[PDB]
Amino acid sequence: TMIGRILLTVVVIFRILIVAIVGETVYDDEQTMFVCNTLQPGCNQACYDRAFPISHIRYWVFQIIMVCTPSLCFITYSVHQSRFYIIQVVFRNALEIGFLVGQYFLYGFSVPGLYECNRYPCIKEVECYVSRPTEKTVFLVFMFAVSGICVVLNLAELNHLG
Amino acid sequence: TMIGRILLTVVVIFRILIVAIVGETVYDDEQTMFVCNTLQPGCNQACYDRAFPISHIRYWVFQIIMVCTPSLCFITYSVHQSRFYIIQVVFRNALEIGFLVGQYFLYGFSVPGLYECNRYPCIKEVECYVSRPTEKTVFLVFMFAVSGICVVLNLAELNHLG
Amino acid sequence: TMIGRILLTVVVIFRILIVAIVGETVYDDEQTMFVCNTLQPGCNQACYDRAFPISHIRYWVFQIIMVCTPSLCFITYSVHQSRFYIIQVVFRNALEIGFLVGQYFLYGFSVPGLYECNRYPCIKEVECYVSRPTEKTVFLVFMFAVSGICVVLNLAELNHLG
Amino acid sequence: TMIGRILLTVVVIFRILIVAIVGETVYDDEQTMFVCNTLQPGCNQACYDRAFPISHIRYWVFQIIMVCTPSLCFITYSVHQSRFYIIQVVFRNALEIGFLVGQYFLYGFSVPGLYECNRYPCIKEVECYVSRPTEKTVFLVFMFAVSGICVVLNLAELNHLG
Amino acid sequence: TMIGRILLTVVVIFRILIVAIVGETVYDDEQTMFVCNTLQPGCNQACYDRAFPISHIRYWVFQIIMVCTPSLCFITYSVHQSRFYIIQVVFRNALEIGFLVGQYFLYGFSVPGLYECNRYPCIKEVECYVSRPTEKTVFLVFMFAVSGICVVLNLAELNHLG
Amino acid sequence: TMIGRILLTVVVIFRILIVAIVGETVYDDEQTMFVCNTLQPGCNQACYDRAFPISHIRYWVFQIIMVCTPSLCFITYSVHQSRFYIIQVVFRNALEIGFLVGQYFLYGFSVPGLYECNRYPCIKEVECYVSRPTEKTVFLVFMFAVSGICVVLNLAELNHLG
Amino acid sequence: TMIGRILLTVVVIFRILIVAIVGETVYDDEQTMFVCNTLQPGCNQACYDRAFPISHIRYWVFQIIMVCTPSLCFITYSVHQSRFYIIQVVFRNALEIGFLVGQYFLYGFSVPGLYECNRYPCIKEVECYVSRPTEKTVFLVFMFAVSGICVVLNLAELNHLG
Amino acid sequence: TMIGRILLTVVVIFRILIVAIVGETVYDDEQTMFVCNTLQPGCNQACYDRAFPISHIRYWVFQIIMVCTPSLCFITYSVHQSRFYIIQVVFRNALEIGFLVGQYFLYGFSVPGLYECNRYPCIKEVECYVSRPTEKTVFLVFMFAVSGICVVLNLAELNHLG
Amino acid sequence: TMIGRILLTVVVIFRILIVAIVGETVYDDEQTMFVCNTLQPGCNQACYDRAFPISHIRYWVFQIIMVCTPSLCFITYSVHQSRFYIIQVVFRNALEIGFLVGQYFLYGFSVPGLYECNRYPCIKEVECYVSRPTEKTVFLVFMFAVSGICVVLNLAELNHLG
Amino acid sequence: TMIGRILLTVVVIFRILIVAIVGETVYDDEQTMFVCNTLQPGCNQACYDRAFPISHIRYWVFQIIMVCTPSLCFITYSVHQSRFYIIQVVFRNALEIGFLVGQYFLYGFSVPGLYECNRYPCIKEVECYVSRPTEKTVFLVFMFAVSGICVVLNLAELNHLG
Amino acid sequence: TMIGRILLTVVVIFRILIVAIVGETVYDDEQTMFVCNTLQPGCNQACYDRAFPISHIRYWVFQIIMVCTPSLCFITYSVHQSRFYIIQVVFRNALEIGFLVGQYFLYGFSVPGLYECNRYPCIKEVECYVSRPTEKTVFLVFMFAVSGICVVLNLAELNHLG
Amino acid sequence: TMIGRILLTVVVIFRILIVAIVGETVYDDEQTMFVCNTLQPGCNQACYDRAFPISHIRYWVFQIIMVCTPSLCFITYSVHQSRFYIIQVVFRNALEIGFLVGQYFLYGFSVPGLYECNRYPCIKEVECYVSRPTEKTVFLVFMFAVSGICVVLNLAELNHLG
């Protein structure tokens, strides 16, 4: 139970570093290199918006910021100065399970190279083509693995205290 | 009444972080990906200007900066060194209610994908198409929720002292 | 007379923050989205240069830097270490009135959406179209209001000492 | 055995500096200057994705971050406060050998100027042309040499203690 | 003679701030908005290179860095620890007069809007058009004025000691 | 022999500052403004790669970093704590002579405005045109002069101790 | 009544010559120089078809051919060989009055330079521009005048016989 | 029965004149003004070929030539020189009924303005737009009416002789 | 008076031949090579229509046909078969004087190379450029000379009979 | 045997009329509407030349002219004036069988819509698309049928005389 | 003197045939393939007009028609029916010498491939390129030779009669 | 010797028909489909002019017209009315041998698909691509064969008379 805290801290810092340093530049050209086979003005905008409603990197930044709020609350309380420890552990567990489930329900496990679109002003159905699908799939899988590790560790400690 | 201060501080910091880190890059391509169905030079400029007079991110930065002025005044006074506390609380309450009302009156609750324009030099009425409407709607709703929380908390403390 | 100093310091810091954080990005696309109805090479350059000789943001940065020089002089003198206080107050007053008058004479109170140009190599008179006129007008008015407040406060203190 | 530690530290810092300062800007135009001889929409995307599944710089950043985790664990343990030293040395050795082998299996020793592509929606086989192949080959060879040096040094110390 | 040092320090800092904060962004589009009336490939490159051999901002950065070297030498000497003071004053005077003369001989007092070019591969003489000439002329004049002030002050002190 | 160390330190810092602040922005448009007279897809890539195998700025950054390694080794040794001084001086001398010779053999003393290319897929020989040749020639000459000064000084001290 | 036949024959031949020699080349560019202010594919086709359902020259050729059929019938009868004369005169009168009335109801008296179109796939209403409107108006008026003359003459002879 | 021959001859000559003089120029731009909403090379060719397999004017020329062959045979026989009259009348009747039926089965009674296409290399279904549909519909109806008249007359004479 | 008839016949035939053989091909590209300096759709059509309301060649064909009508009337009368001779001579004289006067009032004596246009949808005044002005001026002058000769001859004969 | 000559003459005239009146305008756009999926200059020319070495209409005109030479020889002989009749019949038979066989060996029975090309300067194999394949197939089949009829008739008469 | 008339008639007919059959199609693309190195609208029109004021083929048609007028006069006289023969011979001689001299003074003996133009709206001097110069030079020389032959023959006969 | 005249007449008429009916339309697109791999304005004109100085069809028309002049002379002589027969036969023989030799020396026996050009304004050597080379080669060979036949026949008759 001693090493579990050390590894939780290391996993958290590793995740923050990976997201902060490289993720902002895989997605930089997401819409500029999205293209559809069509001559209709406005079809690219509608089809990109329907294929990618919220970008992965925004979701990950939001999750990272939201999973650090109980610590800030505890720190502010202690600065003003055991039950608080229990409650914040419970809240962190709940938040991390919710975020992992939401990731699975929003994105799945892969990013395909083709997309079929039928939104106005596009006439009937059109075919569109995605940028960098393999790298984005790799990123998806890596983030899922890290978040799973964190969930396991927090449940470990929750059950250790009981 | 003890936790209310802690949560107000946490909400303020959370809002600042969310605005500072991600909001500058959803709106980056706002005008470059705005397009209208027309062959008239200058119509895109006029229609973009009429559809989006002040961008959301400018309004939010201004609001964030303006709601922190009473604290700076109090700090400068104390550095030079109860009535001041009362007055600054009143002013903060008023400013935050004004900004929330102004947000509601300026933008509403959604960003549509189509816009109908009838400004010179456009001939009669033309149709234009917006970039990333869903993400911008999500951002709008999130910011409204946070500001509502802050209003509630400040009224709480105002009525607590009385 | 006590609060006047506090509010002058707060106004100065507020102005610096507003100029530094957001103003660099309203004007970023000033020339790339300026367009004229013409087929003559070189007409866009001449008409943009005649319409906007010095950009607003350059003038504001220069003014902000120049109104802080008497303080730097006083600080350097004191570091090396009442008449100096008097003289620097006088100089600050003069500089701020000069800059406000110059702003009024250079730009006025609005930025129009159309511009009429008659400069070589343009044949006769041509019509050109501006980017983001409403936001720029709002910025103009806000900056004028802040500078007026600062002028009033400095005259207040000048007349207080006498 | 005294100098070996000094040179390991120097090699690590040298590698970090080289990757951090210059590598982000050789690869900046990787996809914008990739071009294929074709008139089919979407062929450039598919052929670029098949030729470069994971960019070199992403792999190198990931490797650099992952080879510094045992040190962070040891530091966190000591902050909380010989077997740990042994175990972390073993783990570092294993990680660095794995990463070097993976580099060899993923990329080889050269980047060619031409690429032959046969992925949908491209009709039959098409020819594509790469940007900056010589500089990228030089970078590949340099990184392999540095990582080899590091492997040798860590095996040296492992066998020194035994 | 007391105030002369204070004003020299203030002028130096003012010049550094003006060059560092704004000058990098007037010249950003220098070549992208340079255009010539021609259909010959390569003529724009040759004519831009002949019209602007060294950009103003490079010259000013170089001058600013080179006029601060005697101070660094004196500081390093004193850290290791009157004749040195004399010699460094002489050297600074010489360097600043040389740089002002070189500026006058390289650029003059204005930037014109048209340029006439006769370099290969351009056929006979062609006409080209410059970006932002008025702002660049204003910058030229301002920098000349500041450097003149600095020259006057340094000669003042040189003759004061004698 | 006293001043020689001071001037060596000043030259090193001057070189680092010049390379770090301005050199990254002369070369920014190196490939985007390279153009050849041809209609063949892929010829620009091959001819640019053959004309500029390694960019000047990469070579200079690498050289600057590599000539500071003996100092880092000596510092790490002393932190752990005359022969080391001797050896590191010898190594620095050798490295700086090698880098100067390599510069001369790689680039020479000028950058021409035209380039003649005969690489596949270009048909026979084609003519291409370079961006900013004069500024790049000036930079080449300046860097050679500085490195020569450094070589002279290090040989001076080597022969002083003997 | 003697000259009436001579002038009828001369008018008929004059009309045939004018239609046959020049009319085919005023209308040659009717659709190639028709243009609408729009970016929608297919709008030009629909708007041209709605503005000009049957071209003038087709109608005039058809009318000219149809008003010569009674003569051909009479000639064929006589070749095979007073009541027939009467009947054919009646039929010619009726046909020429019908054709003049139809011309008035189909085309009117002018061809305007602008046209307002609201047909699918055009979005809302668009503005289109016509080629050579003045010449076509002149042709319309001339043809109406000639046909009126012919009607008058044929009624003259009809009433002469009775 | 006397006039029937005269009117048959007149109808035949009228049809020949109408087809020969004007029909070649309604269809002249048939493929050059056919356009589809797509970016796929080769789709316009396939969709035009599927929409219009044999052009109307070719069919009409062929029919006109083929319905005059029995007369040529009879003329050649008589030049070499009642049963032949009978047989040629029968054959003409059969040929004209066959051609009218074939017209009805090939083309129908209208030409629509839109066409829906699903032929390779077009992806799924695309929409295409036709040139001059109303004029072509008018021509179709006129030709059907004339051919009906001719059929009626030939049956009349066939039944007259019996 | 004998030769006058011979020369009138020769002049008439010469004029007909010159108009019929070459004039149709100087004017063929009249609108396709007409160009204006503008980006407004529809401006070329309006400005061409205002500059050239009726083309020269149409006017000349009409005049040639109309001056031969009295001869056709006289021929038809004589075929059916001195006062008629007198009347037709008078009518021919009147028609030829009217046509010459109309030519002078419609076109003048030259065709300029530039045209200044101020018709909707053109914004203010624009400059347009004409095709083949010198050849058209030569043609104008030649036709005026020939028509003058014909007028003189017909007046000669009119006064000869009296 | 009497009717055989009449039908041979009718078939010959029918074939000449069909070829002369319509065939020149199906093939008019043969190369202008031929397109290949490629960016290589010169590939369209080579692939069109390899797909269609001799156009159908040229072959048919040549055949028609060459099968009428024996008649011209016989006519010229008789004008100068039974064995000649025999010889010319034999020659006509041979020529018509040769031309039919050559048609079968050159073109076959269909024109496909796609063509696969591998000629320099095209890189590897490319796909090209044909204009009006169905109409051209119909024309091929019709011409084969007519020529077969003619062959049968000429063999008939040859065997009739013996 | 007998053969001279025969050869004059043959030369005249040969010249007419050569001009009528082929000359109309060398000059067909005269302005469409004329191109200048410039970006100025309207420069091509002015430079083409200045380089080719009257096209060769127009001059040759005019000359051919004008040298046949004396024959028409003589024919008309004889139809109405030695001195006339004399006078018409004199006139033909004069006309043919005048036309040959005018050709020499208008065009010379060659058509160059380059043209240097300095007409408004072209800026300074521009270079333009001609279509088919060699064929046009050959045509010039051939026409001069034929006209010389005709002049010689007519002088021959003039001096023969005396 | 009887049939030789008949076959000469037939060959002459056959050649005239083949040249007149089809040859004008193989060469119609000769320059419009000529293309070179270059970006230099004016290079296509110079290279086309150097590759094809005189077009085949012009040479063939000229030859056909010139080989019929002796017949016209003989006809004109006889109309005015054995040695003349002899002389004209000799002249025809000479002319036909000269024209065949000139054809061989001007064009050879094939038309290649590629052409290598080195004429100003083209830089060094460029590659260009020809239209319809195979058809043009076939035409060349056919014309050579026919002219050879004619030469043989005329020599036959020349030697027959002696």
UniProtKB/Swiss-Prot annotation, chains A, B, C, D, E, F, G, H, I, J, K, L:
Keywords: Cell junction, Cell membrane, Gap junction, Membrane, Transmembrane, Transmembrane helix. Belongs to the connexin family. Delta-type subfamily. The keyword Transmembrane helix applies. One of its GO terms (molecular function) is gap junction channel activity. It comes from the Eukaryota. A connexon is composed of a hexamer of connexins. It comes from Homo sapiens. This is Gap junction delta-2 protein.
